Every structure is written in C-alpha cells, then in structure tokens.
Design a protein around this ligand. Structure first.
Ligand SMILES: Cc1ncc(COP(=O)(O)O)c(C=O)c1O
Ligand SMILES: Cc1ncc(COP(=O)(O)O)c(C=O)c1O
Ligand SMILES: *Cc1c(COP(=O)(O)O)cnc(C)c1O
Ligand SMILES: *Cc1c(COP(=O)(O)O)cnc(C)c1O
Lengths: 372, 377, 372, 377
C-alpha cells in the first residue's frame, strides 16, 4: 500500500471483540487470568497494554521495523535506548543533537560510566577517527535541531556495520513519512512523538523502533524494568495524530519551501538554514535520503532590534517551546535552548520557526509585515 | 486538618482561571510565552504540566514533604530515585524488596556502576555492618511483599543520619493515610500509585516525595532529563482516587482484620502473615509506626489440592497481578511473583508453593469471609 | 450479594477480549460489520456503545430494574422520561421538585402540550384529587431539594397502579444505596448522576432505570431518536464513581447526622431540615422507606448578617452549585436557585449544605467558628 | 485570515491561566464563587463548560455566526433546534432528509404538536405553496444523503425572509470549509460533528450555530433546560479534529473527484451521484454555493452479484454506518439506511437495492481506485 494508505490501514481496522473501527482506551492496570499464567495476551499494563501495543505495532509498520516501544517522552525513548549499553561503553553523537540529548548524555548518563564523543557526522573521516575500542554505537540526528545539518545515514550505517557498531537515528524532524532510516541501514530509529507524530501540541511521547528480535527483547526488558511507559489515553491521541501525518507533512512541506525561498531573498535576513535551498550544505544528499525538506527553518536576522520587533509583531507564529504542530511556533535558540553554542554557530540573532498548516500565503505576509 | 479532611483540602479547591473545583486536564505539550522568558510558570509539559503539578503537590502534602514528582510507573519512580546516585555509590536494601525493585537494582542499575547489599533491615546490627565508605542510602520497604515483614523506620533513619546516609522508604502498602516516613526521619518516600493511591486498578503511576530543596532540584533534573513522566489524564485519575483514599483504607482495614482473624483460626491454614495478628513478627512495631495494618494478607494453606480448590471456587477474589484495588485480588507468589527466585531461598524467606496472597477490597466484609469459607471447605 | 459487594461485582469483572478488570473506553462512533447487518453487538455509538452499555447495565442492577439508560445530564434523563408522554397527557409532580425539573415542565414541555399539576405529595388525598382523565404519571422527588420533604413511595405507587398511572421517582438524593423505589412500586427511577453517583464533582450525567420491557423499548427509542446520550469517557468516570458509592454514602451519613444534631441545637439557627431529626415532618416514614437520612441539610439562620458572615468564614464548605461530592458545598437557594419560592418556605436566610467526606469533627468546628 | 488559517487561529491560542496552546479539558461539574453571584463566567457545567465554550465559539467562528451550541449527538442538535418551535408550529423540510431526521420529525416531534410538510426543496414554487400561516421555518439538507441532490440555499433564504420564516441548513456533508449557509442568508446551521468535523470516527456530537442574539438566548435556554450537552472530553477531541478539517477536506476532494470520474466511466456502473459530475442535477448550483463537491459518492452497480463481489473484495473500504472519517467507509442504503421506506418510494427517490454509498477517506487516491477496480471486475 502507498504511504498515505499505511497511516490509515497499517494495523487491522476493527477491534476483535466489538468491531470498533478505533482502538479502545484500556484505562486499566491489570487483567483477570483464567488459570495461573493463562490469560496469555495481557497480564500487567507496565509490561503490555493493548492501546500502547497497537501504537507500538503502528510505528514499527511505518518505519518497516521489527518491534515498536512507547515511552512517556522523547527523552524517555532516548534514555531507554542508551541504557541498552553499560558502564564502559562509548557512543559517538552528531555534535548538534537536540539540547535534551546533549544534557542526558553529559549530565545524567556520564554519571553511569557511559562515555561519549560529539563529532561532525557530516565528516565521515572524523566519525571513523572517533571510533574507540569501547565504542558500541553511532547516534545521528538528521536534520539537526536547530541548524538542519544533513548526515549521510547510508554511509554512517555502512561504517557502523563494518566496525560492529549499532546505528541509532533520531528521525523526529523528517517523520517516517519523509525518511526511512532502517531502509538505509539503521538498527534503531527513534522519535519525539511530542512533535509531528502527535502533531497537535497535546501529547508528550517517545517511540523507538528496532530492526531485530534481540534488540526488541533487550529494549522491552529496559522499558518493563525502568517503566518510562506511555499511558493509554496518550497512546490513543498519538494513534489519532498518526492518521493525518501524511496530509499534515505535505501541507507543512508546501508552506515551508515557499517560506525558506522568501526568507532567503530578504534584506533583513543574512543567512537561512533549510534543507530545500540549493545553498544548504548537502542539499543534494537531502533530496536523495529523504522525500521532503521538512518544516523547520532557522534564519539569522541582521540585529537584536530586528529579532525583538519580529517577536512582538508576528500574528500566526506563537512564541513557545516545541515544534511539529499544526500551529506555527517561533523560538530564539540563544535565549530558549540551554544545555559550544558559539562553536555550533547559534547566533544571538538566530530565529527558529516551526511552520504550521495555516495558509502558506498568510504565513509569508505575516513574516513580511514582521520584517517591514 | 484531620487526615480525612487533608485528602480533600490538601490543595486549594478552585483553580484560578474559572474557579473549577477540579484540576483541569492540561492535554498539552507547550505554553505561549508573553516575552522570551515570561510565561505564568509553565513552558514545556515534560518540565512541568499543571495537572501533574497539582498531583505532585498533593502527594508532597499528604507525606509532609518539600516537593513531589510523578512518573509513568512505580518502577520509573524507583529508577529515577536510584539514578540520583552515580557509579561507585552503594545502596543497602531490604532483602525481600518487591520483585520489580530487585530486578532494576540487580539487572539494570548494576550495569551503571551502582552497587548494592541486600540486608535483613529488621536487624539494625546487620544494617550497620553493611555500611561501606561508598554507601549513600538505605532503601526500606515496610511492610514487605508478600510476607509483610516490618522494619523500624525511625531506627533506620537515625542510623542513616548518623552515617550521613539518605533514608528512602517504599510506603506503597501503608499509603500516606497509615504511615508517615518523613515524620519518622525519611529523606525520600515513594509509591507505586498503581496500587492504593489510584485504588481503581486503572492507572499505572509512580510518586516520589523528597524533604529538601537540594533533593527536589536533583530529582527534578533527573525527571526532566530522562523524562519518565506521568501524563495529564493519569495525573487526573490519580488525583481523583486520592480523594477516597481515607474512606477506602478504613473499609480495607475492617475487612482485612476480620479476614486475618478468620484465616488464622481456620483448620486448613497453617500460617497467616498480617501485621495485625499479635503473633506476627514486630506486631508491636507495626502498631507504633503506622495507624493501620494493611489490606494485604498472605496465608499458607495445608496442601496443593486446597490451593487449587480456593482458586477454583472463590467468586469475589479475581486472579490477577497487582493489589490495592476496590475489587479483591488473589495471587500465588510461588508461580506469579517469586517464580524467579530458586526453591533454595524460598524456604529461607518462607515462600511455600501453598502460600496465597490476597488483596482485600471494599466488598461487604461478610461476603468476602463467606467466599473464603466456601472455597476452603 | 450485599450492597457494598454489588457496587464492585454488579457486572462481570474481566472484559471478554483481554481480561481487563475495567471496562475499556470505546472512544469510537462506529463498528465494522462482518456482513450487511451481521456485526450484531454494536453498530453506531448513539444507538449503543459498550462503555455506556456497561454503565446502563450497572444502574439497572443497582436499582433491581429491567434496563438502564445514560443521558448527557440529569435534565436530559428527566426530559427523555417526560417525552415518553405526548401532547394532551398530564403529569402530577411533587410541588418542591428541583428548579431544573420545575423549569423544563413549565417553560419547555408546556409548549409541547404536556400538562402538569404541582401537588403536596406528602398529602395523598391532594395527590388523588389532582388526577385528571388525561393523567398518565405521578412524578415524585423524595427527599426534595432543598427542604427535604419526604413522600411515601409505596402509597404513591399503590394509588398510581389503582388509577393506571406510571410512578416516576427522582432517587438522586438517596442514591440506590439508601432507597429502592422499584422495590416500593416505582415503574421508573432516575438520577442526576452528576451528584452522588459520580461523587467527585467531575461528570455531568443522568441515568434512568425502567421496570418493564415495554418501557425499555419506548425509552430506548427516545434516547436513540433525540440522542441526549452520555459519552464513553463520562460513562467510564461514572462507573469508576459507583465503585465507592457505598463507603462514600456511609461517611456522608455519619458526618451529616452529627451536623444536623449540632445545627438543630444552635442559638443562631431557628429551623433545620434533615430527615434524621425526630422533629422533621415524616421522620418515621424516612426511617422506613430508606436505610439512611442522606447528606443534604438546609437550615434557616436568624439574619442576613449571620448568613453573609457564615459564607465569608467557612473553611471547608465551597460556595458553589451542585451537591453529592466528596468535598462540602454550600449554596443560598434564595440567591442561587431561580426557575412560590415564598409559598414553598424558602426563606432569604435559608442555607443548604452538601456534607462531604471531610473529617466530621473538622466540619462541626468549621460550622461553629462560622456561627461564633 | 484565509480558510486554512481560520481552522487554527479562529480562537486565541494561549489560554489565560497558563498560556497552554490547547484548550484544557474541564472534567468538572461546578465552580467556586467568590461571592453569591461573582464567579469568572462559569457556575455549572450543564449551563456552560469552558472546554465546550471554546468548541461552541470555534464552530460559530467557522460558520460566521453569533453563537454556537454543542450537543451529545447530531440528533440532539436537530431535536434542540426543532424544540425552539411549539405545538401548532409548521416546518417545511427537504423530502430526502437523513433517516434519523425523518424519524425525529415523524415519530417524536409530531407527538408534541409540531407539524411538517416534506417538499422537493429543489423546486422553489412547491416550497412556496407548502407555506401555511402556522409555518415558522424551512429546513434544508444540501447535499442530501444518499443521492446528493442540491438545494439553492440563497433562494430558500430569500423566500423564507420574505414570508418571515427562519432558514435552518444541515451543513454536515459540505462542512464550514466548502459551504457557508449564514453567508447565503441562513439563520441557523447545524452539523452531525460525528462525521467530518471530528473526522476520526471517534466522537458522537452535534453542533448548532445561530445568527442572532434572540436565537442564542432561546436555544441556550433549550440546551440548559433539556441538557443534551456534549461533555468536555468529546468537546476536546472535536476541537482537535477541527484543526485538520481544511487539509482533510482538500485530500477527500482530490480522491473523490478521481473516484467519481473513475466510477462514472466503468462498465458495471449505470449511474453515479456526485455534485462534481457535469451530468449531476444542479452541478452548476453545486459549483456556485460551495467551493468543493463532497467526499460522498453513491453509484448504482449493474446487478446483485456485482454488489456482493464489491462488498466481498474491497480491502480499504470498511462496511459500517457513518461517514466523513479519514478511513474509507461503504454502506448499502437499501439494507442499512433506507430499509425503513417501502420499495414504493425507493423508485421515486431512485434508491435501487444495487445502490452503494462510499465515504472517500484520505488513503492514497490510487490505492482506493485500484481497490474499487479489482473489486468491480
Ligand atoms: C511496593 C511496591 N513498589 C513498587 C511497585 C512497582 O510499581 P509499578 O507496577 O507501577 O511499576 C509495586 C508493584 O507491585 C509495589 O507493590
Ligand atoms: C447530514 C446528517 N445530519 C445528522 C446526522 C445525525 O447525527 P448523529 O449520528 O451524531 O446523531 C447525520 C448522521 O448520519 C447526518 O449524516
Ligand atoms: C523535542 C525533541 C526531543 C525531545 O522530546 P520530548 O518529548 O520533549 O522528551 C528529542 N529529539 C528531538 C529531535 C526533538 O525535537
Ligand atoms: C442536580 C439535580 C438535577 C439536575 O441534574 P443535571 O445533571 O444538573 O441536569 C436533577 N434532580 C435533582 C434532584 C438534582 O439534585
């Protein structure tokens, strides 16, 4: 089936007991057993919950992977994944990963003897030079938050496999709809479902898909033991979100390309980050490993006074944390993303916009009037 | 406020926006800021959500604590708490801690350099000679699952404070209604809110209460960084359950004392574990550090055929894992919780494969006793 | 099984498909059919919804009736019930019914040619004298909101049956736990589930139980045709509420008797309405047709200045509409119950309290300090 | 604002309490009052609930109306609206109105003295000579279920205003995205929000928008008095669905035009009902009063055996009542909706027992056409 179809029919429509065209919300902690260990399906909602299970199956189907896992946040998904490894293991990470990943690697998991190196994963020579004897995994975010740097998933995966390393990809920004990391060699693909997958700024959730029975047993053990699960009401809202992922990302795409084009040709804007501009580092790779450029744009305005006046005049962009929502969001990474900032090239005049599904024309006019 | 009033007025009734007598469900990820850094207290739901904030405050109130933290499960609460420690730290634990706790200490957190010693925490001498220079805390579960063994919280706390150690208490079985560990000198108290606090078998949740601002900054940092948060719908259902925790535990208590007496005098029952029997180890301590015995009773029946007849015939006890629900539940520890441990140490901590665990609900007491009676004869 | 047991085991614990000890929330409008008209159980959520159906079965079991029906409010329950009748039919009602029932009878259903007489149902001679040829039903609320007048359900039912009339009882204040109208001859018993049945001030719902297959077909047709249904999330919260109805009403009872006793012996309070006082009209009948006196108290203080000062000083009673909640509520019927007020004896110094499950001692001390 | 922006910024983003970009779910019955009559706008959830208030405002915005009202179902919305009238009032209705509407008019509201005449509302002469002195409104459903027959809303409205009658439009099939009845002169517009507005087959709800304060006082009085309200959870899910109504209907439209063309040229299909075919009655009107044709297509297949093969073989159309969902749905009107009516008037309004109704979802267009193609051959 085509991608739009898979979002509606990835799992069996018609719940067995009643024919409900939706997954029921199993707001329950426990399950009556017929005999000692013989109501097989479900035993305890931490271990498995039918609403969460439908969600875990759906994300595995959408990334073409072996098994899915649902966590209370993106950060719980990221933490459970790194907790596959042990004291003495080493991880290589994209140098401009999300600040939350930066923080958990450097301020939490360091205290547990998990070692890291931050590397420019755009430079495959530097990635290979970072490999230690105790290295177990390469972790890549593409595009990155918020500079949208593009890393070659197929080349990172090939290097990882040659050196006996797992490839972990944060596919949050592209979603399963635009990019397929497992198809390009990734062992583990993960999502802040809080962003595009839910799509309506109303769920905090993380998803992990693994490509192997061994990884599914090992991540299941971590999720069941440390228990950072997604509840069934949130699981239901996330399943509901997934239904419109295709038509949302298509409208996001159309709006964002026109906005990147207009912002890149503006007197008050001297640099624009967006995979769909030919000027963007690795634009060519962006067109090859993904079917869309996404809906996150970062742009550097000429002065503090331009920034401030953009914030106070914008009508349809809401000043807030997060992204991936049907409504347009704006943040100032320099004043809103704490967790080298200078080294990464995150200017004090840099603005990040999350482009919504408002009319593309209203969003351009709103940005124009804001910079006029 | 008396105890029953606290469960209702622990936090202000009337939210500031509309006066709603209930906490609204903030099904939301993010908040509009007036200016970059000016926001009315909420910026991103993982860091703080107002529904979760009301629940975290409520449980902090009920435990007389500095601040509360809500997690997606009891196991997330225990994990987040032990993750306050770092590689080369040592924790002393109660030896018959809950299975899920055993597993996180011995199969997960061991891989992260956190060391442990399992000790009989009923023996303050043995606790003391497990203290190493890298020891940071003593973790106590009282009463224990499933033998309801009792640990002197006030004695553990005073030993701990004397050796500059943190005291952590798993107060799930007693709840804040019967036992107040921070009052007895605990630094940290946590709950599988999945049990009594929710009380309706319909929320999986963990709660942690800390009694210092330093512990609140540190555990908040872990919560926000590792993100095992409870969502707003579960937060609401757990707040809702908290409202009837006092009257639920009073009914649980009355059914349980009568069933514990009933089972202790039945001829097919060799041994009964319940803190309320005068014959139970540290019954005297149980009556000093808590205002109730629980609603959990384990009893050793006379034979395999009896065990199978009671599972066969009970009408009002449902066979299922978990406990602390308004509906009565039964499990066989040997085949359902302590299947992991060998038969070796299952005679040590006396877990026969004729031991039954019942969680006494709020059905009519006389219905539950009649039900046990018919099943057993 | 005893009453406390029935609240936990009235319906089968263990949902067929997974063994869940709870009813799943069927957040769904429609159901896949195997063949044209052959997924039998469920077809469309207006007509039937499995969460709503569990709730409808539970309330029928708790009132020992034939079938249950769940509506979006008490007033939707009351309206669907009167809409069993037609233009030209006449209904007799307790003269001091809830203001909402007063309003729908006199300002809505009058425009549809449903005729009414309001009668003192404490006076069975006046009830019999009110019967017209076009009379179809006697509608009784006992105790009444807010004066707690007690009507003889068995004598009203016997008169109704002799004259070919249906008996409809609003059992909201007593709940199924304290009073059983069907057992005393009632054909229809109904509830504002918004009050004690939900019990936590967090659901608006109405329930109707009927005693006959004919009434179940006729009310089902009205509920399915006019569609004032309770949604499945509210149905789930109401099922959850019912679980603690017994232990709640027992604590309500203990607190309320002590409060009625203290209020009735107070210098600043010159009259107290509460079924459990020997001085209350028909106290004897109250002890006979119900197992409890309930948790609503109305009291007349000596002056406006006493009332005002009670309102501003009470610590544990919240000034709000509604009742039946675990938290204590206070209202002034003279300034808060619009929809004869003088005729009914609703003084401008009359206070209604809904007694909660706070500690009974804290509630007395709070009322004392408030009148000191 | 363009149409797509309105579905997102129709109401203020950022609630006043915390700045939440989402409407909080007010799972609550009542509100603390400061003083007897001072309350911050909410007193009792049946009269007003803030989550329901946001949805009622949103649908009022999208329909360019005075005020909105949310009910527990489409049928509660129609019932509440017709209950604005009294015994001895007369309403003229579109003759092939939805079955549930037929039933409430002819089996419920007839018993309450409300009179009706069913008329072909495509014939303004016939509408006019059904007007009696006791007539108060003309009720129009355009397009109709299941033959998608089209009624001139602007002509009906002007006839109505000339005879001092109210115009009521059931705008369910078009939604506020394609058709704006109040703009064409309607006083009242309503929706089965169960269909497109929710869009995920997971909420039963009705909405009514009125264009005068007198109609807002009167319908609010009915809503509050008779109490067929939508609860806060359903209100939230319906708000959520509204967010994607524009992009859902654009995708629905593209799949439907292609499937309507596909079916109209297939050799096993005699007749196709769809406002978008140039051959459909009042195609010209359809293109003037609405900016889209729908996502509902009825088609008459060649025989019983074809009908049974398509039900047998379709993979992506689910057999089920209802429509307007992201997942594609199929029904047989003769056996599922118009089983009530005799075979007598089922040849009049041409409802063969080989007529299939499909609701086109937002699956890949080419998947749905391939699916119909394989099923039909
Ligand atoms: C005392 C105690 N602590 C912790 C837990 C674990 O909680 P959860 O199942 O919510 O992860 C349990 C569960 O049985 C328990 O009984
Ligand atoms: C046009 C139209 N109006 C009203 C309704 C009735 O709505 P509900 O099923 O929510 O009562 C429907 C349902 O099919 C409909 O299609
Ligand atoms: C927002 C974000 C996260 C964190 O998700 P939470 O749900 O906030 O824990 C992780 N990765 C990326 C790329 C993100 O954008
Ligand atoms: C509150 C009340 C009602 C009305 O219930 P709603 O849920 O508000 O419609 C009806 N009858 C009685 C006796 C009440 O107390």
């Amino acid at each position: 089936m085509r991608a739009k179809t898979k979002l509606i029919h990835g799992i069996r429509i018609g719940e067995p007991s009643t024919g409900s065209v939706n997954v029921p919300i199993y707001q329950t902690s426990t399950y009556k057993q017929e005999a000692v260990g013989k109501h097989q399906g479900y035993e305890y909602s931490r271990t498995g919950n039918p609403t969460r299970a439908a969600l875990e199956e759906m994300i595995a189907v959408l990334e073409n992977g072996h098994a899915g896992f649902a966590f209370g946040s993106g950060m719980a998904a990221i933490t459970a994944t790194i907790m596959l490894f042990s004291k003495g293991d080493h991880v290589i990470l994209t140098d401009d990963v999300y600040g939350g990943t930066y923080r958990v690697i450097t301020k939490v998991l360091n205290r547990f003897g998990i070692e890291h190196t931050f590397v420019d994963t755009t430079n495959l020579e530097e990635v290979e030079e970072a490999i230690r004897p105790n290295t177990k995994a390469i972790y890549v975010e593409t595009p990155t938050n918020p500079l949208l740097k593009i890393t070659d998933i197929k080349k990172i995966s090939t290097l990882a496999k040659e050196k006996d390393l797992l490839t972990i990809i944060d596919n949050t920004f592209m979603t399963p709809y635009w990019q397929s990391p497992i198809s390009l060699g990734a062992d583990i693909v993960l999502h802040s479902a809080t962003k595009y997958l839910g799509g309506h700024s109303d769920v905090v959730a993380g998803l992990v898909v693994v490509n192997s029975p061994q990884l599914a047993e090992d991540l299941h053990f971590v999720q069941n033991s440390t228990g950072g699960i997604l509840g069934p009401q949130d699981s239901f809202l996330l399943l509901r979100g997934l239904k419109t992922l295709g038509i949302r990302m298509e409208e996001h795409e159309t709006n964002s390309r026109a906005i990147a084009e207009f912002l890149n040709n503006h007197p008050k804007v001297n640099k624009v980050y967006y995979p769909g501009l030919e000027s963007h580092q690795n634009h060519e790779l962006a067109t090859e490993q993904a079917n869309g450029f996404g809906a996150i744009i970062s742009f550097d305005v000429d002065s503090e006074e331009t920034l401030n006046k953009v914030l106070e005049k914008l009508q349809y962009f809401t000043l807030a944390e997060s992204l991936g929502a049907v409504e347009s969001l704006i943040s100032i990474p320099s004043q809103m993303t704490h967790a080298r900032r200078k080294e990464l090239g995150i200017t004090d005049t840099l603005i990040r916009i999350s482009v919504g599904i408002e009319d593309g024309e209203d969003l351009i006019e709103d940005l124009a009037q804001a910079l006029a």
